[PDB]
Amino acid sequence: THSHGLFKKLGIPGPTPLPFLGNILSYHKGFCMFDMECHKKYGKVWGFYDGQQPVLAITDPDMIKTVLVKECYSVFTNRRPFGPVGFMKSAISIAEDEEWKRLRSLLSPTFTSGKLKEMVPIIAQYGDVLVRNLRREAETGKPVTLKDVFGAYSMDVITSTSFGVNIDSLNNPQDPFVENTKKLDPFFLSITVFPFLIPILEVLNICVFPREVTNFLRKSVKRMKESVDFLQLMIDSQNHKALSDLELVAQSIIFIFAGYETTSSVLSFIMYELATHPDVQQKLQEEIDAVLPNKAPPTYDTVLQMEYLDMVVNETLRLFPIAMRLERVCKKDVEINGMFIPKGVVVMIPSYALHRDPKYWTEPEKFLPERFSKKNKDNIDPYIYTPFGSGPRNCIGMRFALMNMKLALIRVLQNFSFKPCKETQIPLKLSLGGLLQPEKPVVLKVESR
Amino acid sequence: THSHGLFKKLGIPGPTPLPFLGNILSYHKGFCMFDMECHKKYGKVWGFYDGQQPVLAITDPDMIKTVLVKECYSVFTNRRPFGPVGFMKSAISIAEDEEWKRLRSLLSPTFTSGKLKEMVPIIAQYGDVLVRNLRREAETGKPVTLKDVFGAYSMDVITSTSFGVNIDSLNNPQDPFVENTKKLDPFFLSITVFPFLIPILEVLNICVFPREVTNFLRKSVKRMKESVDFLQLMIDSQNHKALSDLELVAQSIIFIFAGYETTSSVLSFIMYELATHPDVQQKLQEEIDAVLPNKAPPTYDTVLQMEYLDMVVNETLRLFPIAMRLERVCKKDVEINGMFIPKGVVVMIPSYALHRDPKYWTEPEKFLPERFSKKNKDNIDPYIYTPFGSGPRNCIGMRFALMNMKLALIRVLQNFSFKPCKETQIPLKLSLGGLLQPEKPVVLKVESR
Ligand code: HEM
Ligand code: HEM
C-alpha cells in the first residue's frame, strides 16, 4: 500500500483499495461492469488501483480529446507496459515514444485507401470460400457455430493479406502456416499483482507470445525474402531509418492477432444482432440486393456506398467495443482541463462504459442502427463513441477491418439468412474474463435464399 | 547471453564475456586495474558487460566532450540505475531527465561562491577543533590514524553546514545526530548479475540506504522546520516548481555521503603524499606561513591565493580520483564523433585510467605537484583530467569540497608536521573493492611545530 493514498490526497473519488491487490478483486464481475459501476457512483472522473498501479478514469469528452489528441506526443504517448513481451517490444502497438513514432510512420502508407483497394479482390476470394463452407453446414440443418466459419475466414484473409499464403483453414486442417497461426486469465491477474516479477520472466526467455510460433514465422519470412500483401509492402519499403528483419516479424504477428480475433468476434456479434433483429437483417439484404443486383460481386466502391451496412457495423461496435478501454501512460506531471495528473498514472478511457451511458445514448441496451443514420450521426460525439480509439495512436487498421468485415457480410447475406434456434443464448451474455466475447458461443440457423 | 553480441556486431573490441556474468569476474583485481588493462590492450574505445548490461568505455577527449557537454541534455542525461534506492530516487545525483533538471536548478544557488564565502567562518571553527584533537594524539607519540581525525572533522563540517548542528564527533561519541550520521561488496556484485531482482527488493521496502537513519533525519528536519546552512537555503528557497519536504531530506542525505567519505578519503590521501614527500610538505608550510603570518586564521580570500596548495590538491586528485569513473546512460540511438552508440548502452569515462595514462602524463605514478603550476597547467586537457566530472551534471559541490579541504590543510599544517613511521604502508596500495580508499589505513607520525 505505498501509493494507495494518491487519489485521496488529490481529492479524486474511487473504490477503496485492499493492500497489495488494489481493486483487482472488483474485476470478478468483469471489468466492463466494474467501469459502469464506477461511472455510475463516482461521476465524471475516478481512481482505482491495479495492484499498486494507479489508474485514473476520465469520461469528459474534452479531457478525452486533450489526452488522445492534443497532448499525445508530449505527455500521453504510450500504453501501459504488460507481462513478459520479449522481442515483441518492437511491435508497433507495444513500442513507445520515438520508437513507436518511427514504426507508425513506416507502417502508415501500408494502410491507405489506395493499398486497401488493391487488397479487395484478394479478400473477396475468401468471401466466396466462406459462402462455400456456409452452404455445407446449412445442409446439416444443425445450428452453426459462427466463430468457426468466421474464425477460419478471418484467418484466410489475414494469411493472404500479410504473406500471400492462400489457404482454406477450415478444409485444410493442418498446414504448417494454418497450424502455427492456430496455436494462438489467471496469469494476467497474477502479473498485475506481481509486476515486479516481469523482469524475472523476461530474463528466463518466457514470453506471453508462444515462442514456438515466432520461430516458425521468422523462418517463413526467410523462405519468403527472395522466393500485394503486408510483407512486401514492408519489404519493398526497406528497398526515418528503414525497418529491420526482426522488426518485420513483430508487426506481422500483431496483424494476425488483430486480424484474427477482432474480425471474427465482431462478425459474430453482428450476426447475433441480425438474427435477433430479422427486420434489420431483411432491410440490409434489400440494400445489398439493390446495390449489387443478382448476387453481384462486391467491390471497394460498392461497399463504401452501403449506408445501412455501415449503420449496422457502427451500432454493433457501439454495444461491443472489443478493446473495451483506451489507456495512455502519463509521462510527466501535467494539468489537463482543470485537473492535475501526476507522472506515472495510467489514464483510461472506459469506451465500453461511455458507449452504454444514458447521458449520450437513448435506450443504451437496444440494438438501434438508426442512431447512425445520416440524420442522427451528427449529434454523436467522436470522443464518446471511440471503437477504434482516436488521435495519432488510434487503430491503424480501422479502414482495413471495416472493409474486411463488410465484404464478409455482403457475401454471406447475399446467399443466406440467419435465424435463432434452441441453442442460441438469448439474451447474449458477455464473458467475465478480460476479452470482449460471448459467454456461450453464438449458434444460429442458416437458411439458403 | 542475450546482448553479449553487441560489441562484436558493432566491431568494438573488448574482453570476451561469460554467460550471465559478463566480465564481472575481471573486477577481482579491482575495477580501476580492469580499466587500465582494457585501455592498454584495446586502445581508445572498448566494450564490456556488467552482467547483461553493455558498457562502452571512451578515452578520446573530443568524444568525452560530446558526451559530457555537447550532448548531455539530449542523449546522455542520466547515470545508470542501481540497487534498491526507495525514496532516494528523488536525490539529485540519482534523479533523471526533467526531474534531475528541476533539482539541479533548485540547488545551484546553494553552491555559489557567495554562499560558500558565508560558510567559511563556520567550517573554520572545526578546523580549530581538529587542531585541538590533533595536538592530543600527537602527545601519545603513537602513529595517528588519519581517517579518524579527518572522518570526525568531515562530519563536524557537514553536520553544521547542512543543519546547523554544531558538534565534536570525536569527543561526543554518541549524540543522536552524530550516532545516526555514523551508521552509514558482495551485494553490489549480486545486484549487478541479478538486476532483475531490484524490483523485488523495492517492493519489500529494502533499501541500500539504512532506512533507520532516514526516519531520524525526517524527524530532525521537522524539529527544525520552525524551531546559514544547507537546510535553510533549501527551506528559504521554498519561501520551476518549489521543493517538497521529503525531497528536502533526500538531498541532505546525499550531501552527508559526499561531504563525509569524499572529504575524509581525499584528505588522507593528501597527508600520505605530504608525509612521503617532506620537501612538498615543507614548501607548502612556507607558502602557508607567508600568506598567513604567525598562524593567522584562514579566510576565503587567503585560501584562493595559495597556488602551491591548489597544486597539491589537484595532483592528489590526479592520482586518486575518488569517483574513479564517469558514467552516462545513452537515451537514444546516436552517432558521436564518428561512432554509432545504440540506445541503452552505458558510456563510461575511465577517469582513473586517463589520469594515469602516459599519453598525457609524464611519469604517471609520481606525485609531482609542478604539473599544475601556472606554467604547465595550460597543457592539461580538461577532458582527460576530470576529478569532478564535466558539463551540466558535474560535481555541484566542487567549490565547497575544495574550500573545505584546503581549510583543514592550512590549519593542520600551520601547527603540525607529518612523518611516516613503522606502521605506514609504503608504497600505499589501494583496496580492491568498489571504493577508492587505501588498502591499509594511513597512519603517520604527527609532531607539533
Ligand atoms: C473491429 C476491428 C478492430 C477494432 C475495433 C480495433 C480497435 C482498436 C483500438 C480501440 C485500438 C486502440 C487505439 C487507441 O489506443 O486509441 C487499436 C489499436 C491498433 N490496432 Fe486496431 N482494431 C481492429 C482491427 C485491427 C486490424 C484488422 C488491424 C491491422 C491489420 C489493427 C491494428 C491496430 C494497431 C497497429 C494498433 C496500435 C496502433 C499504435 O499503437 O499506433 N486493428 N485498435
Ligand atoms: C573531493 C571531493 C569531491 C569529489 C572529487 C567529487 C567528485 C564528483 C564527481 C566526479 C561527480 C560526477 C560528475 C559527473 O558525473 O560528471 C560528482 C557528482 C556530484 N557531487 Fe561531488 N565530489 C566531491 C565532493 C562533493 C561534495 C562535498 C558535494 C556536496 C556537498 C558533492 C555533490 C555532488 C553532487 C550533487 C553530484 C551529482 C550532480 C548531479 O547529478 O547533477 N560532491 N562529484
So where are chain A's domains? 5-448
SS3 percent helix, strand, coil of chain A, rounded to 5, is 50, 10, 40
Spatial separation of the C-alpha atoms in residues A404 and A121, rounded to whole Å: 11
Chain A positions touching B199 (Cβ under 8 A) are 195-196, 198-199
Smallest Cβ–Cβ distance between B199 and the set A98, A196, A332 belongs to A196
Q: Whose CA is nearest to atom 41 of ligand 1?
A: A393
Type of residue at A236: D
Compute the radius of gyration of chain B from its Cα atoms. Answer: 22
- The C-alpha cell at A438 is 460471448
CA torsion angle A185 A189 A194 A195 (round to 10): 90
User: Residues of A at the annotated binding site?
Assistant: 395
Tell me which residue of B132, B179, B126 sits closest to B157, measured CA to CA. Answer: B126
Which residues neighbour A36 within 8 Å (Cβ) at sequence distance 6 or greater?
A352, A353, A356
For cell 475466414, what's the residue? A153
Task: HSE, CB side, 13 Å, CA atoms: give it for residue A408.
Answer: 27
- The C-alpha cell at A11 is 481529492
Which of helix, strand or coil describes residue A50? strand
Q: How far apart are the first and last CA of chain A?
A: 62
Cβ of A255 closer than 6 Å to ligand 1, yes or no, is: yes
Tell me which residue of A383, A435, A345 sits closest to A57, measured CA to CA. Answer: A345
Spatial separation of the C-alpha atoms in residues A397 and A157, rounded to whole Å: 14
Spatial separation of the C-alpha atoms in residues A27 and A29, rounded to whole Å: 6
* Domain range B5-448, CATH architecture: Orthogonal Bundle (1.10)
Q: CB A352: neighbour CB atoms within 10 A?
A: 25
Which of helix, strand or coil describes residue A55? strand
For cell 499525445, what's the residue? A72
Yes or no, beta carbons of B199 and A199 under 8 Å apart: yes
Which ligand 2 atom is the nearest neighbour of the CA of B392? 41
Which residues neighbour A267 within 8 Å (Cβ) at sequence distance 6 or greater?
A146, A150, A154, A405, A408, A409
Residue B313: beta bridge partners?
A: none
Let me know: does A283 contact A174? Beta carbons within 8 Å: no
Q: How far apart are the first and last CA of chain B?
A: 62
- The C-alpha cell at B287 is 607558502
Which residues neighbour B192 within 8 Å (Cβ) at sequence distance 6 or greater?
B24, B50, B51, B53
Q: What is the 3-state secondary structure (H, E, C) of chain B?
A: CCCCCHHHHCCCCCCCCECCCECHHHHHHCHHHHHHHHHHHHCCEEEEEECCEEEEEECCHHHHHHHHHHCCCCCCCECCCCCCCHHHHHCCCCCCHHHHHHHHHHHHHHHCHHHHHHHHHHHHHHHHHHHHHHHHHHHCCCCEEHHHHHHHHHHHHHHHHHCCCCCCCCCCCCCHHHHHCCCCCHHHHHHHHCHHHHHHHHHCCCCCCCHHHHHHHHHHHHCCCCCCCHHHHHHHHCCCCCCCHHHHHHHHHHHHHHHHHHHHHHHHHHHHHHHHCHHHHHHHHHHHHHHCCCCCCCCHHHHCCCHHHHHHHHHHHHHCCCCCCEEEECCCCEEECCEEECCCCEEEECHHHHHCCCCCCCCCCCCCHHHHCCCCHHHCCCCCCCCCCCCCCCCCCHHHHHHHHHHHHHHHHHHEEEECCCCCCCCCCECCCCCCCECCCCEEEEEEC
Smallest Cβ–Cβ distance between A200 and the set B98, B196, B202 belongs to B196
Tell me the Ramachandran region of residue B109: left when phi exceeds 0, alpha when psi lies from -120 to 50, beta otherwise.
alpha
Let me know: does B311 contact B372? Beta carbons within 8 Å: yes
Choose the mutation target among A20, A53, A193, A196 for the interface with B, i.e. most B CBs under 10 Å.
Answer: A196
* Strand A144-145 relative to strand A45-50, pairing: unpaired
Spatial separation of the C-alpha atoms in residues A101 and A267, rounded to whole Å: 31
Our mutation pick for probing the ligand 2 site, out of B100, B318, B395, counting the most ligand atoms within 8 A of Cβ, is B395
Which residues neighbour A159 within 8 Å (Cβ) at sequence distance 6 or greater?
A165, A166, A167, A169, A177, A178, A181
Phi, psi of B359 (to 5 degrees): -60, -25
**Number of residue pairs across A and B with CB atoms under 8 Å?**
20
* Strand A443-448 relative to strand A326-329, pairing: unpaired
Chain B positions touching A196 (Cβ under 8 A) are 199-200, 202-203
Cβ of A259 closer than 6 Å to ligand 1, yes or no, is: yes
Query: If you ran DSSP here, which 8-state letter would residue A430 be given?
Result: B
Spatial separation of the C-alpha atoms in residues A392 and B84, rounded to whole Å: 37
Please tell me what resolution, in angstroms, this structure has. 2.3
Write out the H or E segment, with its range, that includes residue A222.
helix A211-222
Let me know: does B15 contact B26? Beta carbons within 8 Å: yes
Yes or no, beta carbons of A98 and B332 under 8 Å apart: yes
Q: Whose CA is nearest to atom 17 of ligand 2?
A: B395
Any alpha helices (H) in A108-210, and if so which ranges?
113-139, 146-162, 176-180, 186-193, 198-203
Spatial separation of the C-alpha atoms in residues B416 and B414, rounded to whole Å: 6
Compute the radius of gyration of chain A from its Cα atoms. Answer: 22
Chain A positions touching B52 (Cβ under 8 A) are 203
Chain A: give the shortest CA distance to residue B147, in Å. Answer: 40
Range A403-415 burial, b when 16+ CB lie within 10 A, else e: bbbbbbbbbbbbb
Type of residue at B161: T
